[PDB]
Write an enzyme that holds these catalytic residues in place. Structure first.
Site, short mmCIF file in Angstrom:
data_model
loop_
_atom_site.label_atom_id
_atom_site.label_comp_id
_atom_site.label_asym_id
_atom_site.label_seq_id
_atom_site.Cartn_x
_atom_site.Cartn_y
_atom_site.Cartn_z
N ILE A 12 102.87 90.83 38.05
CA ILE A 12 101.58 90.10 38.16
C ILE A 12 101.06 90.21 39.59
O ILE A 12 101.86 89.95 40.50
CB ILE A 12 101.78 88.64 37.73
CG1 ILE A 12 102.20 88.58 36.25
CG2 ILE A 12 100.50 87.83 37.98
CD1 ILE A 12 102.73 87.25 35.81
N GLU A 35 93.96 96.77 30.82
CA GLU A 35 94.87 95.97 29.98
C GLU A 35 94.00 94.92 29.28
O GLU A 35 93.23 94.21 29.93
CB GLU A 35 95.93 95.37 30.89
CG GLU A 35 96.66 94.24 30.27
CD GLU A 35 97.96 93.96 30.96
OE1 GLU A 35 98.98 94.27 30.35
OE2 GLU A 35 97.94 93.41 32.07
N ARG A 100 99.49 99.17 32.29
CA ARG A 100 100.70 98.72 31.56
C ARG A 100 100.76 99.44 30.22
O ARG A 100 99.90 100.28 29.97
CB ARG A 100 100.70 97.19 31.44
CG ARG A 100 101.04 96.46 32.73
CD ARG A 100 101.70 95.13 32.39
NE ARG A 100 102.11 94.33 33.54
CZ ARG A 100 101.52 93.23 33.98
NH1 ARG A 100 100.44 92.73 33.39
NH2 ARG A 100 102.04 92.61 35.03
N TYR A 160 97.32 84.04 44.78
CA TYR A 160 96.48 83.14 45.62
C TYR A 160 95.16 83.86 45.96
O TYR A 160 94.09 83.32 45.65
CB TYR A 160 97.32 82.65 46.81
CG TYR A 160 96.59 81.93 47.92
CD1 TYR A 160 96.39 80.56 47.87
CD2 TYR A 160 96.18 82.61 49.06
CE1 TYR A 160 95.75 79.89 48.91
CE2 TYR A 160 95.54 81.95 50.11
CZ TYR A 160 95.33 80.59 50.03
OH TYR A 160 94.70 79.91 51.04
N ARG A 162 93.59 86.35 44.41
CA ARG A 162 92.72 86.64 43.23
C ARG A 162 92.03 85.34 42.77
O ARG A 162 90.86 85.41 42.33
CB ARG A 162 93.52 87.31 42.12
CG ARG A 162 92.64 87.73 40.95
CD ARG A 162 93.41 88.58 39.97
NE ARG A 162 94.64 87.94 39.48
CZ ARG A 162 95.69 88.59 39.02
NH1 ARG A 162 95.70 89.92 38.99
NH2 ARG A 162 96.75 87.92 38.56
N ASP A 211 98.80 96.10 52.13
CA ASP A 211 97.40 96.19 51.60
C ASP A 211 96.96 97.66 51.55
O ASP A 211 97.18 98.39 52.54
CB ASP A 211 96.43 95.38 52.46
CG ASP A 211 95.02 95.22 51.88
OD1 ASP A 211 94.23 96.15 52.00
OD2 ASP A 211 94.74 94.16 51.34
#
Ligand SMILES: CCCN(c1nc(-c2nc(N)cc(N)n2)cs1)c1cc(-c2ccc(S(=O)(=O)N3CCN(C)CC3)cc2C(F)(F)F)ccc1C
Ligand SMILES: CCCN(c1nc(-c2nc(N)cc(N)n2)cs1)c1cc(-c2ccc(S(=O)(=O)N3CCN(C)CC3)cc2C(F)(F)F)ccc1C
Ligand SMILES: O=c1ccn([C@@H]2O[C@H](COP(=O)(O)OP(=O)(O)O)[C@@H](O)[C@H]2O)c(=O)[nH]1
Ligand SMILES: O=c1ccn([C@@H]2O[C@H](COP(=O)(O)OP(=O)(O)O)[C@@H](O)[C@H]2O)c(=O)[nH]1
Ligand code: NA
Ligand code: NA
Lengths: 230, 230
Positions: A12, A35, A100, A160, A162, A211
């Site tokens: 995630i 997804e 995925r 956090y 997103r 990043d």
């Protein structure tokens, strides 16, 4: 031109959606299948069903895990088959990047819900029987997997960033559990699946702790090198 | 020799299993696909799953209706496809008799569970989406339907004769509800389905209020005449 099928896998908020939106822009021979669950987490009958079942899951996982996992997986198979039959006709080197796979549906998400007692034995056995059979009705088998490897702490920070309200309560402990399953499956290759070819499928592991939104060229270079070996 | 596919439809304890066991013996060109749910109501992983989910359904239909209907329908598709690909190679006039169909799963049983509030809207919409799609992944479309038409009172008496402990509490009112759906679908043909060909499929209606176990020759004669018109 047979379409190459490549799954992007990872925890995630590892950065899969970010990475797949970078890739799609870099080549007319490159297409992506986002997804279905990710789209439910933002009009169509699938999105209304998906939004309802995701909200109910947050309230009572032990009631809704079976219903959610069956609809998530069917939604993914439908979207993957649609792209495979729709797109990249007259590509020279066609590549379809799946966000995925049917394998993450079962071996990461559904497995964890069973292990967390949110599916009983009958629910989990019905699900695996459904999955074993639903998959044989074939053209979705993977040419390769790209594993975007981030620490739980990185993924927690990116949840956090997103800023989806529903996800701010997800504990580190959940991320650690999903991380261990990804490491067993895609790094150590300890995980036993019921899909014999998966033992042999090439895997590219990319470290995405740093990043990459404005600095992804090294990552893409490894993707292009990986692709040329398949 | 393309296999003719004929569904046997009718209420609970109308006599479908009795009739299909008569038919199978009368010709080497005639084979039957017994209904998976009927086998769960008597070793295999399907039977253990099916027996558990049927018992849980009796306890709490509003929890288990979605899980039951999805496994019942998938179990039927698998068993029908197996027979279609397995049997009657080198039959002269091959006929496969299905005990009920994917259409009775949805338009009789699942529809009634939704109407009885044992599935919520999301469960029922997910189920129909699953069914619409699961059916397009085709070779199971029916050449004809044989409707074994009995009164609710007849079916109630035959539930008593068959003597399954779990069924002795079924009320007449349930049988009347399923009867009305069968009459709408197969007699009046008022029922709107999402399968356009079904409007046009030939239907043979047989009155089975009278005991036929030792006196079925008239019924079979109508089946052979029906078959010769397809
Ligand atoms: C963003 C995550 C949403 N989320 C899920 N998504 C998927 C999913 N499935 C796909 N096939 C594809 C796909 N993309 N996603 C499955 S479930 C989800 C997860 C939890 C949940 C579960 C288990 C723990 S736990 O093991 O840590 N543990 C257990 C013991 N105790 C209670 C303590 C907590 C935690 C949590 C949590 F935290 F997210 F809620 C609850 C609901 C939900 C919708
Ligand atoms: C032998 C019947 C077993 N049975 C079922 N089988 C199937 C089934 N599905 C297939 N896809 C294929 C296939 N072959 N069978 C579906 S459900 C079943 C039915 C009931 C049930 C439901 C609704 C009423 S009701 O509408 O009358 N009504 C509602 C309002 N109130 C409470 C009052 C009662 C009644 C009852 C009853 F009576 F059977 F329990 C409860 C559980 C069960 C397993
Ligand atoms: O290199 C990155 C990768 C991701 N993100 C952010 O991390 C969050 C999660 O990323 P993504 O949605 O791509 O994760 P997925 O769940 O799709 O793996 C988002 O707010 C991204 O903008 C970031 O800032 N830098
Ligand atoms: O002409 C008949 C048809 C059926 N039965 C009995 O009715 C019950 C229900 O029949 P069946 O199981 O065939 O019903 P289905 O549920 O398969 O329609 C059983 O005890 C049968 O032996 C009967 O005595 N005479
Ligand atoms: Na592209
Ligand atoms: Na026979």
């Amino acid at each position: 031109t047979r379409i190459k099928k490549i799954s992007i896998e990872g925890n995630i908020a590892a950065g899969k959606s970010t990475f797949v939106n970078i890739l799609k822009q870099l080549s007319e021979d490159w297409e992506v299948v986002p997804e279905p669950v990710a789209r439910w987490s933002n009009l169509t009958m699938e999105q209304k069903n998906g939004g309802n079942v995701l909200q109910m899951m947050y309230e009572k996982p032990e009631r809704w895990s079976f219903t959610f996992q069956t609809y998530a997986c069917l939604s993914r198979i439908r979207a993957q088959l649609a792209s495979l039959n729709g797109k990249l006709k007259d590509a020279e080197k066609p590549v379809l990047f799946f966000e995925r796979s049917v394998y993450s549906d079962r071996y990461i998400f559904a497995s964890n819900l069973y292990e967390s007692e949110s599916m009983n034995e009958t629910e989990w056995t019905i699900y695996q029987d459904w999955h074993d059979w639903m998959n044989n009705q074939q053209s979705l088998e993977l040419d390769g997997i790209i594993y975007l490897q981030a620490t739980p702490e990185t993924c927690l920070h990116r949840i956090y960033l997103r800023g989806r309200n529903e996800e701010q309560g997800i504990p580190l402990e959940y991320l650690e559990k999903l991380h261990y399953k990804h490491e067993s499956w895609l790094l150590h290759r300890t995980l036993k699946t019921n899909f014999d070819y998966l033992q042999e499928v090439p895997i590219l592991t990319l470290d995405v702790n740093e990043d990459f939104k404005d600095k992804y060229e090294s990552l893409v270079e490894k993707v292009k090198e990986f692709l040329s070996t398949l």
